[PDB]
Symmetry: C4
Subunit: 332 residues, 4 copies
């Protein structure tokens, strides 16, 4: 049995080759932002409410048209065949069965149409290409295959400095490819995407308050407050530390998701209490995939669902909206 | 000789089976709140007063009708026969002899009437039952047996995630039972209890300021500001960190107790200086019981009494009321 | 050569019996205040001034009538024959030769008249006795022997809980006695002392702002902001953390000294910059005495004098008054 | 390959004699300020901007008349033949080739005319001499040799207490000399220098806001906010912690540089975001010189240039001016 997400990290470290575990675990530079994502969540304490009706605790949310079983989606993580032979199909099947949205990557190692054919709630994560037209073509491919939202990742004009990868001499195995086959994206790219599709466009990698405001003005349906899991700018603030200010600035004008460092249902509760609509979870999903394939991811999502229900009810929240109204206190 | 409560922890760790020591010591989840209870007290420094009359330093208080020898009571801890064969009777006898209130548990391993027959100042701690009527029946049983206050624990709609217990496969030995034999309690349950008894109702597990205010409005005679020793919501704020704000909000409308992490008479002084009427002490009482039964608990209460007197007088306080008027400073 | 006061601590630990080193080093309780005295100084950073005239840097001050070579005096430390056979005479001779005031203890292991006969600038530290009349008699004895100030220690209604001493079973060797041969002192005792002598009365152990104000109103010539080296109330705030608020409240109405944790000339500079008139130094003087007797104390005072001159000049201060006008910043 | 500046520190520790590595690495006193320079940078997080045009990211700045390839110069470090036989010539050649200003030291181990003959952008760092006239003569020598700015170091009325050097018995080898061959400098010295040369005078070692303002009033063309790498006053605030307040006080009246602890291009970005015109880098340049002479310094400057470009672009900054408008957040 796994009783925490940390149990899955230990299992994945046992099974994966060291250089693949380091590609997964590592951040850029000194890994200051990778560590700070965890420090920031550990400093947040919740002030629970008592004596409220918990007859029907529900962890469901509605987001981008549709019901999700938890306030969580699987983050976009490139090249999932690095971690298990079934790669993205194993994760997308488990996400579908758990009622959790799965984000299909531009750099997926199985084609986006095959993963979308699994069913469930697929979103599609876009990187802008130097060849523009390939960008809007991926978007249209995703929409034609049934993806529900376009998650436009905006924090990768190029890959950050991954010193573990450099020191390991890491490269993709011959058997892992970009099965769908960086330019800096700008606000003009966002408008090109928004014009090309009626799906909600979600800008992922926003940390500045004024960029969140501009995203609403630009017609985004959501943002993901994120420093890319500490893998891009080393020293970028954690998303969790900007979330409350961004939620206030947005005034309900779009959905505000957060990612980076979510390692338990209690962390999901903290993100909700700071105002997030939902969270993304990246590395833990890959730990479960590495450890035990589709069944591993299933067990992870079952464990997270139980932890979120436990934390919500112990905090007096019968719904995710109630959890958003909880207050927090920073500790040491 | 034990010269600190930490000496008793070391003695109990020697004698108890590991899985029982872990049931006692552990918290929920990552044990963030278990640790934070201690961190929070360690950050509080007292500003002592000098040159005041200390001719007659007294640690006594009046609470819920009656005199207590110290501003402290034994917290409700279920199943005390886990720790020593005499269980609750050993602890209740030592508490009586020390002039300290003892809280009889709904989940006591000796019946509440037997423990109440020990004498002293017994309080009774209630859990709300799915069978309501059993709830009001326990209350009436407690009142009929001479209990002085009903401590209604409101932070357990269900048991939190005790990972030590899960990993140890912990269960009650066959020889430990609930000798008096969870539903979520609500404010309606509180009113049902308040209507059923003329004893003071004390709501235990309050952390939000508005819940403390509502408790006064609901007719509570006291509250215990508490995160259940870090055993329920992992990431719940320590009670000590909410205490000052709650004492201000209550405006003397009820007694305000605190628990979590009290490990010395100096910690009692800090809680008093932050405004507590009294503290509860949980794990250290069980350490003394495990180490040396009734005589162990007696020695613990003698040591705590000496530490409280020492700290009060060194801080210039001839009474607990004077200690409540001390100022504090947070450190690092 | 000793190049820091920490070199002397290491030397004293080598030479002294463990239980005597623990009597010297230890604090009360968990030693929270003993540690916090050091933490508090380590958090203070100085903002130095540049490009000022340093032609004649002087570390001298005038205090309680007389010139001192440094803004420092030897703290009162009982029973100095515990540390070296010459005890107080060795320390008082070195202090005299360095131009530093030496505080003669009520509990000195050489009589106050013998130590005063060494010469120099002796102050006398008073404990109030249950036999009052013995108190005013010690004061008159000190004045008759040439002491310049009465340092009335007010934070010892009784000795704090010294767990090292308890665990070691520590007691005075037969060869160490109180050669001049606790009741709680009150403000009435202060007035009795102030009436009995024309010497300045300095109240040692003040931490609350209103007690500092009351000391000025009571006719004190000085106060020592102090938690008794962390040896009395465990959890008492460090004096360094109250110093700035106290200096502001006093408005120049008396001298404001500080002690606790001074381990370098840079620490003296920090205390001055926070507003202290001078500091006391306790344990390091005993380390030097243990290590090398009178010559050890001489070397310590020479090293401290050089460190204070170095720090003052590097901070742009040609006088201690200039150092008091420096600004500080708290760090981590 | 070196992939971080920390790789070069490890290489230099391998090659240099321990006492020379300690002369380079060490600070004064307890090395509180040496450590705090690093702590202060590690607490700064950047809030990056997204979706801006990065077609032409440039790290160039204009400073003191001339273009520099990065917002950085080589700090003045005395006696560089301690670290490699080619000493200052190796470093100045690599700096020239990288388009980075090199600061020639008053205490250089190769004469200032020889180093200036390397070409590039040489600045000259002045110490004030007890023989004044030698001071203005060095200035005129530097100007005659083509130096572009006079960096007047004002924080060394004498050398701080270098306990590593004392404990190692460190002295200059016979083969290292002051090839150009302390008095306290004052504002009058600054005016003497400003009158003697039309080059910009840059005062290095300013930490107080009012000294920065006075520097502008005195006609300085720049200041370096600096605690001398933690080598002078132990307990002096880090320059990075004063930088923002100083930049605000100066109101664009002079260039404001900072040094101390810069160990990556991300640290350069943080200093820029706090308002620095440019940084100086000291110890890492000497690590590269020790490790591999001129080619080592070349590799260091190439690595720093790539790290600055990476950090700027990941933070959405196409120019150093844009990076100065970034906001920051302090973390833990
Ligand atoms: C752990 C991991 C995270 C990510 C990726 C891969 C790995 C192993 N991807 C890439 O390598 C993309 C790339 C970038 C540069 C060069 C080649 C490929 C990836 C990505 N985000 C995204 O939009 N698309 C991606 O394709 N990320 C961030 C992820 O979406 C979340 O932001 C964090 O994982 C939340 O933090 P976590 O829960 O603490 O892990
Ligand atoms: C250490 C311990 C504490 C408690 C318990 C047992 C143990 C070993 N109890 C239960 O397992 C109840 C239960 C819950 C879920 C499933 C079965 C039983 C218990 C309880 N509080 C309460 O109302 N009634 C209880 O019956 N608590 C908290 C206690 O009252 C104090 O809140 C903290 O002990 C102060 O923190 P401490 O001084 O640092 O320890
Ligand atoms: C380290 C030490 C300090 C002190 C003492 C002895 C020792 C070894 N004395 C006693 O045992 C008095 C006593 C108390 C209770 C029972 C018997 C004797 C002593 C004293 N202060 C004072 O008025 N008179 C004293 O007779 N102190 C505090 C001292 O004056 C300074 O407050 C701190 O030493 C600054 O902190 P430091 O620089 O970090 O050490
Ligand atoms: C690491 C080092 C730094 C410096 C020096 C030598 C060493 C090995 N110099 C001296 O020994 C001068 C001296 C002083 C007293 C007695 C004899 C000689 C030196 C200097 N600054 C300056 O104006 N001129 C100098 O001649 N410094 C500071 C340097 O300019 C930077 O302020 C810090 O190096 C940024 O911090 P860093 O990037 O973390 O290293
Ligand atoms: Mg996450
Ligand atoms: Mg407690
Ligand atoms: Mg001291
Ligand atoms: Mg630097």
């Amino acid at each position: 049995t796994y009783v925490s997400l940390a149990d899955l990290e230990r299992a994945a470290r046992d099974v994966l080759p060291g250089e693949i575990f380091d590609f997964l675990a590592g951040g850029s530079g000194t890994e200051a932002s990778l560590v700070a994502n965890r420090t920031a969540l550990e400093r947040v304490f919740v002030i629970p409410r008592m004596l409220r009706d918990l007859t029907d605790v529900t962890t469901e949310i509605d987001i981008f048209g549709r019901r999700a079983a938890l306030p969580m989606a699987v983050a976009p993580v490139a090249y999932q065949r690095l971690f298990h032979p079934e790669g993205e199909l194993a994760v997308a099947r488990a996400a579908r069965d758990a009622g959790v949205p799965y984000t299909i990557c531009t750099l997926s190692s199985v084609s986006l149409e095959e993963i979308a054919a699994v069913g469930g709630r697929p979103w599609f994560q876009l990187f802008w290409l130097r060849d523009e037209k390939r960008s809007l073509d991926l978007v249209r491919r995703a929409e034609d295959a049934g993806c529900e939202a376009i998650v436009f990742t905006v924090d990768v004009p190029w890959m950050g400095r991954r010193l573990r990868d450099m020191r390991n001499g890491f490269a993709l195995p011959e058997w892992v490819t970009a099965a769908n086959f960086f330019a800096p994206a700008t606000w003009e790219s966002v408008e090109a995407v928004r014009a090309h599709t009626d799906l909600p466009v979600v800008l992922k990698g926003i940390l500045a308050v004024e960029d969140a405001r501009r995203a609403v003005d630009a017609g985004a349906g959501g943002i993901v407050v994120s420093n890319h899991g500490g893998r891009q700018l080393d020293g970028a603030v954690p998303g969790i530390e900007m979330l409350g200010e961004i939620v206030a600035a947005v005034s309900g004008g779009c959905e505000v998701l957060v990612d980076g460092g979510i390692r338990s249902g209690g962390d999901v509760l903290k993100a909700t209490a700071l105002g997030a609509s939902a969270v993304l979870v990246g590395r833990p999903v890959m730990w479960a995939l590495a450890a035990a394939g589709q069944d591993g991811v299933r067990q992870l999502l079952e464990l997270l669902a139980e932890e979120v229900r436990d934390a919500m009810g112990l905090a007096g929240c019968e719904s995710v909206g109630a959890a958003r109204r909880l207050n927090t206190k920073l500790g040491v």
